[PDB]
Nucleic acid binder design. Structure first.
Lengths: 175, 84, 156, 106
RNA sequence: GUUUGACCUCAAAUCAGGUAGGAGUACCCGCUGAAAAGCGGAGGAAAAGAAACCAACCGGGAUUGCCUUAGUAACGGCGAGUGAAGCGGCAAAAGCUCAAAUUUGAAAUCUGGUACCUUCGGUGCCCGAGUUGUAAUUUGGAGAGGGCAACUUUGGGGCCGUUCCUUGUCUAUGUUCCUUGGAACAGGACGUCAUAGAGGGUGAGAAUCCCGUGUGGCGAGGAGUGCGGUUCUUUGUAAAGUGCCUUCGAAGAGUCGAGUUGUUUUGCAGCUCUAAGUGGGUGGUAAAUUCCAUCUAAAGCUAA
RNA sequence: GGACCAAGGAGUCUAACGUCUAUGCGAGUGUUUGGGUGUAAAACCCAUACGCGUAGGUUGGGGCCUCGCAAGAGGUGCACAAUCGACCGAUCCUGAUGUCUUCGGAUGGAUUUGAGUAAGAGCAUAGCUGUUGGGACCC
């Protein structure tokens, strides 16, 4: 999870993180100048949804770089792109563009007031925490085991209630 | 399946501090004196405020809540010494 | 038998230190109570022999199947078609009271109690605040307990 | 690579142990008196199970001390906690039935 | 007092008593380590082991091992493939000891020497060790001091058995006729034993020739507290346990942790920094200036 | 590639998927981790878990029935196939009743969809074989 928030102010957002990819593999295959001014690419409206609009605003305030950055006299063609796919922000990094950076699949969770505590103001119901997914798995397995035990009980019933009696005309019936 | 309340077992470490151990620790405090970064730290409070003091103490320490307690402790030392 | 040691020990004039054990490891003596040593059979099992005793061999829930060993005839369900002894001996033995001895008193301290019995009599608040002959400053009622034990021992 | 050729043999040896230990423990059972304890983990939470030991408070509710109860062959766990009523009561009835059926030599 | 003596330290002893090494090394435990070797250390096992655990449940409860979890989770030019764990069932089951506050109305503790004695030791005496702390009591599951009420309990020997080990000895029935053969143990006829027709030897396939085999019996010498009887003693204001009341009620720091480096796939190691006491560790949880859960690290032993 | 001759001498074993066949049981199946038992590495019995699976019409048409001496005719129709359906899930539009101003999916469409529903077939053992990997037919 992460939070990013203005520490004297009302904004506070919680995002979930999926599908990370690193600088180690050939997916980057290039370095850039650490400290160049970033460009953004908002590959989404970020306007019609007010909470996504606040997300876009606070990402601008967060990821906006003042000239106090060292090695900022060079511009390393550095650009980062944000893309709400369904409600997941795919975040990519380019330097013609070559992916030179780590890869995100990012997910909104909740928005609350204050600097870290203030009351919960917005929450997207579309997110599921993976603990609940594991809980679904365990609950389904417990239901399966319950049904399997009940079925075994009914099998032993049917085996008891499966016996057909002898004919009155048989040797064991006589004797 | 209805309820039953167990007697909650709390460790004796989690109970409180005794008069004896507070006496022990405080009596060690004036005998041991200050370590040299503590000698720096009281002066750094007196010179440049608890903001920079907490920051330097956290740099000396590993974490932040310990730096809180360290700065608060040296404030207790300054209050025990200067007024009294 | 291809180690140098085993071949030399084979060819040696010493002879093998041979001891036979495999017969006698199956049979066991029970070593503990002569009553069970009487009723032990060496033939049934630990399990069958404890069952024939009446003592619960394993406490709870044996894995596997016990011998139901065909004590009765079980008939098919028609589904409504259309038209102790050794236990008693050990129970007596545990029920048998052992020859016990009463815990008596030591001669010096009963003499001490005898001094207190003549100095104060029977009352306890005076003898509790007595310095001489109560130098251990005995508890109020420990005095009573020791004096009642002493009186039941001697002097009513 | 390992093959359990001794699977037939070790069982025999194990029953020899279950014989030989029993020889020393001649009246007493081989196993202690264990608690009947409901399992965790929602797949198994309807299952009841053999537990390790009861508790101090339960053995006090049975009417004896755990230090004495270990001499009677009752397994005792201090670090378990009794939190269900019916578990507690059923195990108390178990303790009482175990007390009813023993005879102890002085 | 330029003397004398306590100590403390450090030497020396052909002083007394002990102990280390080397071999082997299947299994075990550490260290190092390539394209395993090596090193070090043990034992009959070793290691691990009595939660600073696992969980999220109707919670579980030291360790170990088996089956399942499962070729799953997870990891991986997510390529090669790598590859768990909770729970469950079973085997086996066992728990304990220190370090913190005084015994201060008496260091109550122990090695050693010697004299005896019933000698894996005991008693006495004397040197020492030790307060810079050896005993008793207390390890959180508390515990301690008292007090009350009761109850409840006693330990140590012997001897003889038993148990265990090592042995010794005893315990059936054809060598009946014929043929063949150098040799019957072969073939035929007639038998006997059997809880003994396993096996071997004897000039060829021997239950019955011999040794054994089978069933029981009688010994002998040890080990030994495992228990079972007898027998001798053990108390001294001795030791302990349970309920109630009262008063208290102390614990693992160059550690935790932080950064970095190496190493491993998160620990470990080095270097630097370096804490707290209603503390700390760890995990879920949120309707959020959250609640709840669960253990006590930095001391130790422990069969199967 | 070879003087001759004797002996030895080269597709074995195991693991994972796969077809086929046989066998037992059957929507269930699988004893053998383990326990009990025993004449004792055999056989015999089995508690709790676990594993894998389970959770409409028309046209024909094997046959069968009727009639027909027969030939043939009529009827019911196994498996399976084709069609027209239906429904579920998806698909892209319709966007109602309501509606917290952005929520909602009601109804009606549309194509394909799918080892889909519309009345199971699997589990276990053995054998023969296919692919892969262990030195893998041998040198």
């Amino acid at each position: 999870y992460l939070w990013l928030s203005k520490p004297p102010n009302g904004p506070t957002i919680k995002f979930y993180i999926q599908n990370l990819h690193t600088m180690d593999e050939x997916x980057x295959x290039x370095x850039x100048x650490x400290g160049s001014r970033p460009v953004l690419s908002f590959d989404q409206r970020f306007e019609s949804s007010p909470h996504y609009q606040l997300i876009k605003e606070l990402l601008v305030h967060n990821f906006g770089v003042p000239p106090x950055x060292x090695x900022x006299x060079x511009x390393x063609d550095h650009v980062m792109s944000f893309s709400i796919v369904d409600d997941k922000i795919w975040v990519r990094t380019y330097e013609s563009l070559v992916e030179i950076g780590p890869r995100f699949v990012m997910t909104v969770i909740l928005i609350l007031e204050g600097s870290f505590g203030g009351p919960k103001i917005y929450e997207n119901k579309q997110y599921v925490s993976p603990n609940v997914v594991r809980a679904q798995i365990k609950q389904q397995a417990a239901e399966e085991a319950k049904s399997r035990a009940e079925a075994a009980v009914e099998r032993k019933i049917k085996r008891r209630e499966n016996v057909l009696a002898a004919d009155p005309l048989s040797n064991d019936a006589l004797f | 399946v209805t309820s039953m309340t167990p007697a909650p077992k709390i460790s004796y470490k989690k109970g409180a501090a005794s008069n004896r151990t507070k006496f022990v620790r405080s009596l060690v405090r004036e005998i041991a004196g200050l370590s040299p970064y503590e000698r720096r730290l009281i002066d750094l409070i007196r010179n440049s405020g608890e903001k920079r003091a907490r920051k330097v103490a956290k740099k000396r320490l590993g974490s932040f809540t310990r730096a809180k307690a360290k700065v608060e402790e040296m404030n207790n030392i300054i209050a025990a010494s200067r007024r009294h | 038998m291809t180690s140098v040691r085993k071949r030399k020990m084979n060819r040696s004039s010493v002879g093998k230190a041979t001891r036979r054990n495999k017969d006698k490891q199956r049979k066991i003596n029970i070593q503990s109570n002569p009553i069970i040593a009487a009723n032990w059979d060496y033939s049934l099992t630990m399990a069958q022999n404890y069952k024939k005793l009446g003592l619960r061999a394993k406490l709870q829930t044996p894995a596997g199947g016990k011998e139901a060993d065909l004590s009765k005839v079980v008939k098919r369900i028609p589904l409504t078609k259309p038209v102790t002894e050794v236990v008693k001996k050990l129970e007596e033995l545990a029920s048998r009271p052992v020859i016990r001895k009463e815990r008596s008193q030591s001669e010096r301290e009963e003499e001490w109690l005898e001094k207190l019995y003549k100095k104060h009599g029977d009352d306890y608040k005076k003898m509790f605040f007595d310095k001489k002959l109560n130098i251990y400053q005995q508890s109020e009622g420990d005095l009573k307990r020791r004096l009642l034990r002493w009186k039941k021992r001697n002097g009513i | 690579v390992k093959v359990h050729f001794d699977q037939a043999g070790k069982k025999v040896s194990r029953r020899n142990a279950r014989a030989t230990r029993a020889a020393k423990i001649a009246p007493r059972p081989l196993d202690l008196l264990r608690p009947v304890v409901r399992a965790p983990t929602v797949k198994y939470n309807r299952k009841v199970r053999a537990g390790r030991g009861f508790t101090l408070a339960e053995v006090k509710a049975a009417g004896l001390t755990a230090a004495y109860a270990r001499t009677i062959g009752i397994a005792v766990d201090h670090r378990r906690q009794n939190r269900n009523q019916e578990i507690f009561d059923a195990n108390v009835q178990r303790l009482k039935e175990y007390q009813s059926k023993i005879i102890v030599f002085p």
